[PDB]
Each structure stands twice: as structure tokens, then as C-alpha cells.
Copies of this chain bind each other. A is one copy, B any other.
């Protein structure tokens, strides 16, 4: 049941496998190269036409009955984070291949052509800049990104150069709007929503909007013994209260996620009230108006907490990504796909960002989620079951088939 797909996942999982069992494949390395060629051999087996674009993106084309028809794109990525799993990335790609090759084996024809794409560098690990391949196909790679360097200090442009890739030709990788019918990506959930409901497959409603705000809280460093409670300007105590406000305000909507996952304290002694505490709100929600409305509540409540406790709080916005709603054509297709196959229709937002987010400016997008065991992602523990991947490939298949009809 979903053998070929599972066998390919296990096999690809060997490429850059660590002693941990996890994987590490950075862009523009021999390992991702080995991976790209391995996936490419699966693309040939499926009867696809194989090429790489100007951004290093790997593509398999299956012609439709109208060579001039607009393209249905299915992909995901091959690169990983450092000690990553072997499902985040390849599921989408390998299921993509699985979908077309099934079609060719059973002599199934489609009006539109279907391209399976493995995008260059979604996770962003090597140059700390993410989603290089998909921005490129979308035509929104900033030249600021070419100047990013890795640990060994080689720049993206330099890496690209070494790889045979003239950064000058990067615009050639772009697809113009209206050459693409749509884009669909099968991905593991990366959370426990689906495992908690007890279902293998969900439909993505969209990719949540995001904000990173850095909180800097300034007080007065002072010896603990010397400083009565009534006199203090304790910014760690201030931080603790704000972190609670964050939780209260994210819980309130039923829809939002809010997290403080990093927090530095200055100076950092056991017996010293801190001078400064810095931390970063990670705050997301599918409706931007809700996200910001949530942020306003945190801001207003923080402002008073500041004045009450005689400390200074400045915030800075580090990153903003607007939400991307999934399209009705893709969603309606995945729903039909499930009903046909006897799966319940389960809707859910994608908290994390994906290559799909970078394709919205140029075509309608959509996504399908596969149950994630214990929600684990980006580590060796990452696991989706063979049958669950099977479930997701059937749906993908029937979602792609629909979209590629006239």
C-alpha cells in the first residue's frame, strides 16, 4: 500500500543521513546533488521530461493533450535543515512523481500538462535565506539574497557560480503570470492537529500571516539584597507579565498562535535584578486583521504594564509575512478528491510557511496535509506512517487530476 512511494522515501533518506538517522542536505552541496539526481531518475522512470531551471529547480514534465495549455504544478523541496527528518520535503516531491507516473502507467491523459518540481533551498539552512528556488520561479528573489554567505563564508552568488549558474540568468527561471494553472503541495502537518482528531489527511485553508516583534525591556540593574521590592524596576518581572499577556491574547481568538521561544537577560547574575531583557514574539494567524488586532491587545496591555512598573518597553518588527489563503479551485478539488476516496473532509490552516507561499503572486495555490506523528518536525524523530503517506498520495493524485482538466 503506497509501496513505491515509501520505498523511495526510505532510499532518498539515505542521502546525507546522519548517525542520528536524520538528514542534512544543504543547497549547492554534493548531497543535495545526489538527491536531485536520484529524484531525477524517478522522474525518468515515470516518462517525464527532466530539466533544471536557472535557479537550480528540478522539474519533471508530463505533456497534456494541449501542448499550449497552462501548467499544473506539484512540488515541494529536497533540501533539509541540519538534523532533519526525511518526510518534510520529499513527501511532496515524491508523491508528485508518484502521481504522474501512475497516470502514465495507466495511460491517463490530461488537458493541461503537469510539472513536478523540487524547489531549490526552502529551509534556508546554508545561507540563512529561505525559499530561494520558489521566489526565483515566482520572480521575487531579492538581489540582497545573492550577497548572503554561509558558514564557510562563500556567498550564494558564488555558490551559484561554482554550480554552473550565472546569477545574471536568474530572471529566466521566472514563470510569467498565467503560464501556470495552479500549484498544489503535499506536506506533512508539522503539528498534532490531525493526530489529535485521528485522521490521516487534512485540507489546507491557507498559510497563516506572521509577525516577529522583538521586545526590549529596560530597568535598573541593582544587587538583590540591597533592593527592596517597593523600589525595584525589574525588567525580568516585567517580561514575565507580558509573556503571560501574550498567551492570554493569543488564546482569546481560538485561531491565533503566540510564542516566546527565545529570551536573553542582561547582565545575567543570580543576585542581580537585570538591566535588560530581550525576547521575540512569534505571532501568527490566518486572518491578518485578527493577527494585528491580537498584536494591538498585547501592545496596549504591555504599555500599561510598563507605566505601572516604571520600566521602558520598545518593540521592533523583525519580519512580516502576509497570510496566503488557499484558492477555491484547489480546495474544491481536494474536497472532491476526499469524498471520491471515502475520506472525511477536514479543514485546517498551515501554521508554517512553504514554497507554496511564494507562488501565490503568480497562480492560485493549494495544499494537502498528511498526519504527523507526535507532530514532530525538523528532527530525526520526524515520522509519517506509510499508510498515511499513501492516503495523501491518493488525494494529491485526485486533486491534480481534476485541476488538469479543461
A220-277 residues at the B interface, CB under 8 angstroms: 222-231, 234, 236-237, 239-241, 243-244, 247, 250-251, 256-263, 265, 268-274
> Do A226 and B351 have beta carbons less than 8 Å apart?
yes
Q: Which of A225, A239, A375 has the most CB of B within 10 A?
A: A225
Q: Which residues of B contact A243 (CB under 8 A)?
A: 236-237, 240
Q: Which residues of B contact A259 (CB under 8 A)?
A: 224, 234, 236, 271-273
Q: Which residues of B contact A349 (CB under 8 A)?
A: 225
Q: Which residues of B contact A284 (CB under 8 A)?
A: 224-225
CB distance from A87 to the nearest CB of B (A): 14
Q: Which of A190, A193, A237 has the most CB of B within 10 A?
A: A237
Whether A129 is near chain B, meaning CB under 8 Å from some CB there, is no
CA distance A216 to B251 in the complex (A): 25
CB distance from A365 to the nearest CB of B (A): 17
CA distance A229 to B192 in the complex (A): 12
Q: Which residues of B contact A263 (CB under 8 A)?
A: 236, 263, 265
CB distance from A164 to the nearest CB of B (A): 34
> Do B229 and A247 have beta carbons less than 8 Å apart?
yes
Number of copies: 2
Whether A189 is near chain B, meaning CB under 8 Å from some CB there, is yes
CA distance A153 to B359 in the complex (A): 60
Q: Which residues of B contact A378 (CB under 8 A)?
A: 223
The residue that A226 contacts in the complex, of B191, B230, B262, with Cβ under 8 A, is B191
Q: Which residues of B contact A351 (CB under 8 A)?
A: 223-227
Nearest CB in chain B to that of A245: its residue: B240
Whether A207 is near chain B, meaning CB under 8 Å from some CB there, is yes
> Do A190 and B261 have beta carbons less than 8 Å apart?
no
Q: Which residues of B contact A226 (CB under 8 A)?
A: 189-193, 350-352, 375, 377
> Do A268 and B257 have beta carbons less than 8 Å apart?
no
CA distance A224 to B209 in the complex (A): 12
The residue that A261 contacts in the complex, of B262, B271, B280, B375, with Cβ under 8 A, is B271
> Do B257 and A352 have beta carbons less than 8 Å apart?
no
Whether A208 is near chain B, meaning CB under 8 Å from some CB there, is yes
Q: Which residues of B contact A282 (CB under 8 A)?
A: 224-225, 270-271
Interface residue ranges, A against B (CB under 8 Å):
189-193, 196, 207-208, 210, 212, 222-231, 234, 236-237, 239-241, 243-244, 247, 250-251, 256-263, 265, 268-274, 280, 282, 284, 349-353, 375-378
Please list 5 pairs of residues, one from A and one from B, whose beta carbons are closer than 8 Å in the complex, sorted by A's number. Answer: A191-B222, A212-B270, A223-B352, A225-B257, A261-B273
